[PDB]
Design a protein around this ligand. Structure first.
Ligand SMILES: Nc1ncnc2c1ncn2[C@@H]1O[C@H](COP(=O)(O)OP(=O)(O)O)[C@@H](O)[C@H]1O
Ligand SMILES: [Al+3]
Ligand SMILES: [Cl-]
Ligand SMILES: [Cl-]
Ligand SMILES: [Cl-]
Ligand SMILES: [F-]
Ligand SMILES: [F-]
Ligand SMILES: [F-]
Ligand SMILES: [F-]
Ligand SMILES: [Mg+2]
Length: 454
RNA sequence: UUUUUAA
């Protein structure tokens, strides 16, 4: 395609020969690297090849049709590129299993080559089309397993066909800060039926709609970012609220804003120290830029207990995080195992694979991963760890554990095996004065509400 | 059993 640089922006125009998904031009990494005027995303092209050909050489998607600021161009390119390559990656892996057989002894073995008419899986990997589809779209031999059930990677790919390629100019207020500090409370307190609430997290959506109804008697419908990107916005919007905004790449947020076209402003609420977006290819991310025109910070939690605040303040928030919660009972460590969950406890674990056995172990209880719980408040958390090893989700710096510990406003049980390195920190949280007064919180909050409403 | 997420 053609690439221009009208001062001081970048414009890519696709030509009739070009491979295009919606408004995004599909380019090979080398084509990007040959182009001097695309040098602002050469790090992206290099990162695409380093995680594809070595692990063609992948693809780089670029927004076309509009003069875009360089920073937005970078963000939109990187975000759309990750979606495209993740779909290719998953499908290529499935294609490898179907043609070369599974790699033992991995989870590749849990896939089954089956005839499309003899399976009951709703979605299916079609070996002739080289993509995942509904079972009734496939004819003959198909591969069936967890990545095809459902094929999120295909859903996200199809969403690229409607992804905006030109940022929407509007005020973007960021409210960032520590867990439990009232970022989501702001959305629940200010949302009107003329607004749109989105969330980077699915369970957080239901928490919002329920809390707005219970607290303000107002029926709203919060949607995930993915739901909006994958399904569009078919009504005018005054304020766009994005909760758990740091779970999404900046270019995804730009695409969401241009899809919604809010008439007044955008408010992003989030915490970069909690779970973000992961790339299954673990590509180095270069262009997750700040897109806010104003940024406010919250350092005082209302939810998190003193023992938990002491731990995550020290690990993740440079000791600046405090809490107004007076709960200071010790965290219960169970390696024996001497404990059972009480009614109302949220049962949490870091691994999706362990959720199955825990649901059986604790029928009637809420059970989910730490990552899926992000944004929720619970009276008690019953965390279970089935195995102790060097998995990064349980590392000391893990954002997953950060989220897990900060879900409770009171009791926390950590059920694990002896030798769990986390036991030391849990039974001996860092010392310090991590307590704040309610009015310190109120004056911090007032500064943010003054700026949001200004 | 390495984590988001559509209808
Ligand atoms: N005045 C208040 N404003 C906000 N939250 C409050 C207030 N009083 C008590 N809380 C409690 O603090 C918690 C704040 O959590 P939330 O808004 O979900 O935090 P975040 O979205 O910042 O993680 C809620 O469970 C709420 O019940
Ligand atoms: Al929170
Ligand atoms: Cl950190
Ligand atoms: Cl409190
Ligand atoms: Cl106490
Ligand atoms: F939080
Ligand atoms: F939070
Ligand atoms: F939260
Ligand atoms: F939150
Ligand atoms: Mg929240």
């Amino acid at each position: 395609g053609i690439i221009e640089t009208p001062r001081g922006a970048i414009k890519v125009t696709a030509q009739p020969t070009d491979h295009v998904v919606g408004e995004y031009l599909v380019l090979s990494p080398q084509t990007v690297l040959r182009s001097q005027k695309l040098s602002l995303i050469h790090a992206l092209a290099e990162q695409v090849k380093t995680c594809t050909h070595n692990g063609y050489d992948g693809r780089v998607l670029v927004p076309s049709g509009y003069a875009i600021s360089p920073e937005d161009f970078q963000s939109l390119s990187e975000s759309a590129t990750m979606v495209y390559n993740e779909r290719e990656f998953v499908n290529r892996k499935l294609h490898h299993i179907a043609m070369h057989g599974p790699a033992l002894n991995t989870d590749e073995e849990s896939y089954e080559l089956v005839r499309a008419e003899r399976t009951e899986h709703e979605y299916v990997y079609d070996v002739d089309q080289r993509r995942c589809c509904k079972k009734e779209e496939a004819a003959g031999l198909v591969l069936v397993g967890d990545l095809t059930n459902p094929p999120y990677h295909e859903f996200a790919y199809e969403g690229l066909k409607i992804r905006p390629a030109c940022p929407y100019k509007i005020a973007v207020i960021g409210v960032f800060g520590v867990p439990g500090s009232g970022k989501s409370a702001i959305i629940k307190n200010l949302v009107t039926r003329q607004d749109l609430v989105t969330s980077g997290k699915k369970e957080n959506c239901q928490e919002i709609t329920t809390d707005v109804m219970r607290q303000r008697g107002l029926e709203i419908s919060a949607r995930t970012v993915d739901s909006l990107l994958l399904n569009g916005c078919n009504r005018p919007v005054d304020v766009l609220y994005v909760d758990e905004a740091f779970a999404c790449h900046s270019g995804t947020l730009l695409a969401l804003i241009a899809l919604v076209r809010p008439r007044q402003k955008v408010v992003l609420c989030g915490d970069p120290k909690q779970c973000g977006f992961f790339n299954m290819m673990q590509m180095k991310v270069n262009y997750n830029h700040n897109i806010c025109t104003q940024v406010y910070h919250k350092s005082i939690s209302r939810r998190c207990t003193l023992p938990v605040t002491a731990i995550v303040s020290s690990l993740h928030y440079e000791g600046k995080m405090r809490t107004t919660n007076e709960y200071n009972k010790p965290i219960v460590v169970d390696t024996t195992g001497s404990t059972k969950p009480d009614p109302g406890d949220l049962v949490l674990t870091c691994f999706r694979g362990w959720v199955k056995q825990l649901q059986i172990d604790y029928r009637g209880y809420e059970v989910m991963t730490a990552a899926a719980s992000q944004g929720l408040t619970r009276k008690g958390v019953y965390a279970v760890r089935q195995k102790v090893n060097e998995n990064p989700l349980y590392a000391s710096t893990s954002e997953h554990v950060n989220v897990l510990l900060t879900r409770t406003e009171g009791k926390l049980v950590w059920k694990t095996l002896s030798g769990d390195p986390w036991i030391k920190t849990l039974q001996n949280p860092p010392k310090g004065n991590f307590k704040a007064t309610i009015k310190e919180w109120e004056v911090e909050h007032a500064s943010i509400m003054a700026g949001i409403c200004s």
